[model samples]
Target: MWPTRRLVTIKRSGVDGPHFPLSLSTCLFGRGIECDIRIQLPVVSKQHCKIEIHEQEAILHNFSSTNPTQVNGSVIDEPVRLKHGDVITIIDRSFRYENE
Candidate 1:
């Protein structure tokens, strides 16, 4: 293990089915056509949020501007560190972070 590689369970439909693992240094998630993880939702913006894998931690950045990203039921407007079993929600979809 590289220690930085992590998995985020995508709890959305038609976006990955059950769950998917993060397989890169950076992953862009949103309703944008250019996003790595794009979803077709009303509340999701073109550039909703992003996930980055760092040296010792993973992080989530919000860029929706209109719709806020929820982390464990709380809204996060800034970049936040992601921990194991952390629940992240964008629009109505939810995700869970897991260290692998």
Candidate 2:
């Protein structure tokens, strides 16, 4: 199933400092257990960030100056759907999954 809605927590601090989490609300989809949220890079220019949805659970996607993005340890240019406890970097960062 496709994602119906999504909520995101953005950090003002770069991936290195304490995360100042802020929630983002998005809904084109109705109520469901699954959803996808694309990462938006405020610093990157011209090009936009992308995400691929592959599940029905809340995921925490993180990228930092030290790390890129990845799936199962493989590097990915586009966003990848995350699973429970999926490590977050193609090279060096990490994140958590919070699903209800």
Candidate 3:
């Protein structure tokens, strides 16, 4: 059988401030997984980036791209992306990147 690599996808709850990527913002199950940092999105809150996991749900945070943090040009606050395996961007940080 396939490994069925499931990722526990969640987002910053309805708070106020930016959920910028830090040493603490991590996957609930664990933190040994690999995370890709900054792709530099364009967003009003250039500190958050939307996240998507393999074969799981997608979530949004204060990540960024170069110009606008948009998925097909929609403002993400708490929406879910049904797709999987997409490149996501975070802030000017690398809280999730690692090497094997």
Candidate 4:
């Protein structure tokens, strides 16, 4: 009845991170007040980026080409499909997606 069960977590320094279910059509991450995952950092844009599911895969899209997002240590300039253990780093913050 619902989308496949999945989740993501944002890692923080010396502590647990925030976890959110991948239930929405699109998940926003940024410092904006309306973002789903809000971060307060100067390097992070207001509407930094978004993640969504399409065809049973999670796709990471970068909103700012000037400040591209990193996937597993390499910077991404375009939408990149993610796997179970791929790590996404935006500025100084990092998060990982899990489908297992």
Candidate 5:
């Protein structure tokens, strides 16, 4: 089987958000209804961030000027390469990245 598929798990207790599968080369994440991975938090921007999938790795890009996109615990100002087990936090919600 092809094991290059990637995903992110919404780190919430209830059904606020669902786990997102990176099926496309570009995956958009935000609180907007148009986003691919929509996080329904008020603090999250409409076009918050996105993930670009390449041959070898995936990269996270932050688009919100007021809000922040964090990898692990630190906020990312520039595009950051994603790795397995990395925690991506947007506003107060967090997602755990997974590659399989």
Candidate 6:
């Protein structure tokens, strides 16, 4: 259970912005008011993306057709499996995915 528990640390100004624990089966990220984690940045879409946590690992799926979601600097067209120390970027903003 500890291994499957994941968290995302948002980066701001070369430091940690805020870290969110992925305790739910699905965690939403977007600029929209309805999203679980609402990022008000212009570049972020209303329904930007989500992290789907499974038994073994977590997956990142981009919901935006216009905005791009990158994992470790590469744009992902398909759902990407996230590993520890992986960096997930939405335009200039970033989040470091980590798990115990």
Q: Sort the predicted structures by lDDT, highest score first.
A: 4, 5, 6, 1, 2, 3
Candidate 2 per-residue lDDT, tens place, 1-100, comes to 4233333332332543223121334211111223223233343322222233334543333332234455556765444566654534322223333333
Write down the lDDT of every candidate, Cα atoms only.
0.74, 0.35, 0.33, 0.77, 0.77, 0.76
For residues 3-91, what per-residue lDDT tens digits would candidate 4 score against the true structure?
55355556675554867776576878788977766788988988787887776778888887888888999988888888877888888
lDDT of 5 by residue, 30-67 (tens): 87877877877788888788888777677898898777
Question: Which residue pairs show collisions in model 4?
Answer: none
How close to the true structure is residue 94 of candidate 4, measured as C-alpha lDDT?
Answer: 83
Cα RMSD (angstroms) for every candidate in the order listed: 3.4, 9.7, 12.3, 2.3, 2.6, 1.9
Per-model TM-score versus the true fold:
0.78, 0.34, 0.29, 0.81, 0.82, 0.84
- Candidate 3: tens digits of C-alpha lDDT, residues 39-89: 232322423443443333435443333433334334444534534443232
Give the TM-score (vs. native) of candidate 6. Answer: 0.84
Candidate 5 least-lDDT 10 residues: 8-17
Specify the highest-TM-score model's number.
6
What is the number of backbone collisions in each predicted candidate, taken in the order shown? 0, 1, 14, 0, 0, 0
Residue 99's lDDT in candidate 4: 66
Per-residue lDDT tens digits of candidate 1, residues 77-100?
788898877878887887766766
Could you give candidate 6's per-residue lDDT for residues 37-92 as a string of tens digits? 67878878876888887776778988876667888889878778898788888877
What lDDT is reached at residue 89 by model 6? 87
Off by over 4 Å in 2: 1-22, 26-68
The residue-level lDDT of candidate 2 at 84 comes to 51
Which is the better candidate, 2 or 3, if ranked by TM-score? 2
Which runs in model 1 stand beyond 4 Å of their true positions? 2-17
